[PDB]
C-alpha cells in the first residue's frame with residue numbers, strides 16, 4: 001500500500017485533463033502480485049459512469065453529502081503507461097450531458 005498519484009490527459013493532447021481535479025488522494029496497493037489503484041472520486045453525482053480499459057470502476061464506498069463522493073477502485077497492468085478511460089458527466093441543472101475519453105497514467109507519488 002503506497003501513496004500514489006494519478007495524471008490525466010485531454011485525450012490525445014498531453015495537456016493535463018480537467019478530470020484530474022475530481023480525483024484526489026490516489027493510493028496504490030498490490031494484491032495477488034497485481035497492481036490495484038484505490039482513488040477518491042469527489043463530486044460523484046455528476047458521474048453517470050466511469051469506465052477503465054471498457055468496464056466501470058468498482059465503488060467501494062458511496063457518500064451522498066456534497067454532490068456525492070465515491071471511493072472508486074480499478075486495476076492497472078503496468079505503472080508508467082497510459083491507459084484509456086471513459087466517463088459520462090451528467091449535471092441535470094446545468095444541464096451538462098457530455099461523455100469523454102481521456103488517458104491516464106498512475107504513478108507513485110514520491111520516490112519509492
Ligand code: HEM
Nearest residue numbers: 009010011016017018019022043046047089096100101102
Ligand atoms: C464533474 C464535472 C466535470 C468533469 C469531470 C469534466 C471533465 C471534462 C473532460 C474529461 C473534458 C475533455 C478532456 C479535457 O478537457 O481534459 C472536458 C472538457 C470540457 N469541459 Fe468539462 N467536466 C466537468 C464539468 C464541466 C463544467 C461544469 C463545465 C462548464 C461550466 C465544463 C466545460 C467544459 C467544456 C466547454 C469542455 C470542452 C468541450 C468540447 O471541446 O467539446 N465541464 N471536461
